[PDB]
Amino acid sequence: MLKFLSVRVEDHIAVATLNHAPANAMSSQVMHDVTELIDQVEKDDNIRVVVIHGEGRFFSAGADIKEFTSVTEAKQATELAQLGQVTFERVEKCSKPVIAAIHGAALGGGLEFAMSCHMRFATESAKLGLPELTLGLIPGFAGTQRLPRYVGKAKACEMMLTSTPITGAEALKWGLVNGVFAEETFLDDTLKVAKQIAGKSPATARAVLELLQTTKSSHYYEGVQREAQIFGEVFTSEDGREGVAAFLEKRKPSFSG
Amino acid sequence: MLKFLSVRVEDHIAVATLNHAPANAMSSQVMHDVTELIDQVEKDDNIRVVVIHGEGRFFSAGADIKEFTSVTEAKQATELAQLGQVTFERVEKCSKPVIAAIHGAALGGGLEFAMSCHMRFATESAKLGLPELTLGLIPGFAGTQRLPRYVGKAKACEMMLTSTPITGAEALKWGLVNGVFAEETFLDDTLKVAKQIAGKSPATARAVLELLQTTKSSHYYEGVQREAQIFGEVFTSEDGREGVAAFLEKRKPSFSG
Amino acid sequence: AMLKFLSVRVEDHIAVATLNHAPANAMSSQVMHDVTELIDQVEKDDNIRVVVIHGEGRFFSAGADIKEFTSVTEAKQATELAQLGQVTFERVEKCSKPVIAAIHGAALGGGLEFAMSCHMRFATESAKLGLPELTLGLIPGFAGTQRLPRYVGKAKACEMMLTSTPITGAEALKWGLVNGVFAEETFLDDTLKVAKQIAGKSPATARAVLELLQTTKSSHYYEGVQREAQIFGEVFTSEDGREGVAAFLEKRKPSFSG
């Protein structure tokens, strides 16, 4: 039993429910639970597919702002960025297909999690985005590398620099999700997909997943290293401290370079 | 010279019709014919563009699964995969533009053939997919590498793991075809494109085609090799045998790997 | 050096640059120098946080400048002009501040190559976007052969270059060649609203985003740009290239030998 993830297996499908009330923030503990889920999924021969969704209104609204306050320093910040990067690389490397079922919102760290899953389905009105620059920070869980490789460099640029999220319907247009389903049947419609996948032989599922990883170049991996380093730098900068303080104080930050 | 392809040159457009009854399956002999067609195209100064289409219902419904059952060892299955891979690479490397005109369906090996062409046009209702996993197999003619580079790895994953084809209209949305035409004037509309292309200088068409190949990395090429290796292993596995036997006998396979 | 065919105003930390090389905003060598100066200015000025580039008159830019590609120009000079454009456009893409192209009317050939070198693009629904160089028996020489397929996919890029037919702004949005389309009546203003959102961000995070986005270009993209300039020169002095350009200047269809 994991603290913020509950898992129920039915017909070789592990349905994992993220439950870190009220917005399912990707805290350090949740990351540990994610790594444990992937370990469990990889060892259980009965499990052929995993579907991940959020409890409550949201898939996941972000990383946990409580771990990024004034009390945290630059080395811990780089390390926290790297914990999310490592965790989400474990998800993406999972030998069993992992589907993110998104309703409500997947923002920031939450979208970075979803992005590391092999497939995503969303409701039409779900909000997907990377609003980290509102805090004077950058995405630090590989979002700067994953997002442009989904939606292209230009859209990714716009989404990061404006911080504005896009709807599930728009994310479909831009290739950030696989498909949209109605809110009423959304989890069930995603489970239908999982059930089709569960019918295929494990060795072929594994093979497809492996062969899909060839787009992860050494330029990609070095980008992820760079992102973690930059994250720590901006985090401890005057502008990064101000951005985070402004958010907590419900005011518009003032950046000075 | 060419058994299951016939080529007619009119107004600098080579129209190649694939006709390998019943389903235009991509057999070893077909591969040979395609290689010859490409050498012919490159060497005939009168040819400026090639349009490839299927005789009958389909562009091509897949590899020749009957011919697959002549295989008794992994190495032979890997060799058959490599033959397709080599054949389609010769297509993609062709110094004259090659258009696939898809009506009805392009599935499995047939989609892999179309994907090696420079451009693709389709009818709204055509079915395009990679259903090899229904056979306990994977795509082995570079489909694992080409498909995600068209539609994105998420959509490619869904396509391969579910085996469900997408329509021509959907393939357009996902970037797997260039365009869709009405089913009544489909081949005429594709030929209008080819005629526009035939108006350009041969050295410029060759230059454009060369310059487009920079999108293929070492990871792509290594991926193709790995795909061939995996293909042969899954082919002679119990589940591979079962899936092929089940398809041939028109029943649902029973996987237990 | 005052800018010759560019003008720049700065408001709310947004440098608004207007290309004005009448009548079609052709990307001449002088225009390239102006663009390089703009990027130089923008990178030096801590007060500028974002750039929006648009065209004066009917077009963003209708092409490179035909006056530099006549029978009097030889091969070495043609390759060097291709290289000028490529290097200028790489300066734009490598800019440490966000650059937005706001396209109305048309962005064609060298003009689209320019717009493609910017980080984002917005267009009107009826703007024409394309690479029509093969009409002249030439190829795109300002990195279009490498940038275009990385926006729209190799298949669509192939079709655009081989047919020379432009696509609409609305189609360009579908194919990922622009970020968005706005109404022709509020077009520049709608683009400036985006610029203003971006100018609210810390300069270090904006720089970091841009740098981290560079990783999408392979070593083969860079080799490809160099090969493109090499081919451009060869085709430029070839019988077919000389004929495409002469036919264009004479307002007739070209007839090509091979």
- Cα separation, A80 vs A125, in Å, equals 30
Taking an 8 Å cut-off on Cβ atoms, the answer to whether C211 and A227 are in contact is no
Taking an 8 Å cut-off on Cβ atoms, the answer to whether B162 and A211 are in contact is no
What is the Cα B226 distance to its own chain's centre? 19
Query: From the candidates A42, A67, A112, A222, which is the catalytic residue?
Result: A112
Let me know if domain C1-258 sits in CATH 3.90.226.10. Answer: yes
Query: From the candidates B92, B132, B170, B227, which is the catalytic residue?
Result: B132
State the DSSP string of C23-86. Answer: TTT-B-HHHHHHHHHHHHHHHH-TT--EEEEEESTT-SB--B-GGGSSTTS-HHHHHHHHHHHH
- Cα separation, A65 vs C148, in Å, equals 40
Query: From the candidates C133, C171, C211, C223, which is the catalytic residue?
Result: C133
- Cα separation, A15 vs A101, in Å, equals 10
Q: Are strands C14-19 and C6-11 parallel, antiparallel or unpaired?
A: antiparallel
CB-based burial label for C213 (10 Å; 0-12, 13-18, 19+) = buried
Angle at Cα B20 formed by Cα B17 and Cα B21, nearest 5°?
120
Instruction: Give which of B97, B99, B94 is closest to B52, Cα–Cα.
Output: B99
CB-based burial label for A249 (10 Å; 0-12, 13-18, 19+) = exposed
* Chain C: residues touching B (Cβ < 8 Å): 133-134, 137-139, 145-146, 149-150, 153-159, 161-165, 175, 218, 220-221, 223-224, 227-228, 231, 234-235, 238, 240-241, 244, 253-254, 256, 258
Approach to solving: X-ray
Instruction: Give which of B206, B201, B208 is closest to C256, Cα–Cα.
Output: B201
- Cα separation, C123 vs C60, in Å, equals 10
- Cα separation, C221 vs C45, in Å, equals 30
Instruction: Give which of A102, A33, A14 is closest to A61, Cα–Cα.
Output: A102
- Cα separation, A128 vs C132, in Å, equals 37
- Cα separation, B192 vs B9, in Å, equals 15
Q: How far is CA B176 from CA B39, B114, C158, in A?
A: 26, 10, 13
Strand order in the sheet with B98-102: B5-10, B13-18, B49-54, B98-102, B119-123, B179-181
Q: Measure CB to CB from residue A211 to each of B154, B227, B239 and give the nearest one.
A: B227
Q: Are strands A119-123 and A98-102 parallel, antiparallel or unpaired?
A: parallel
B132 labelled catalytic:
yes
Q: Please tell me what DSSP assigns to residue C8.
A: E
Q: Map tokens 């032979």 to a residue.
A: B76
Residue B188 neighbours by CB under 8 Å, 6+ apart = none
The structural architecture, per CATH, of the domain A2-257 is: Alpha-Beta Complex (3.90)
Q: How far is CA B217 from CA A106, A237, B146, B212, C89, in A?
A: 32, 38, 12, 12, 24
Taking an 8 Å cut-off on Cβ atoms, the answer to whether B211 and C227 are in contact is yes
Q: Measure CB to CB from residue C209 to each of A160, A239, A240 and give the nearest one.
A: A160
Instruction: Give which of C210, C232, C60 is closest to C146, Cα–Cα.
Output: C232
Taking an 8 Å cut-off on Cβ atoms, the answer to whether C204 and A257 are in contact is yes
* Resolution in angstrom units: 1.8
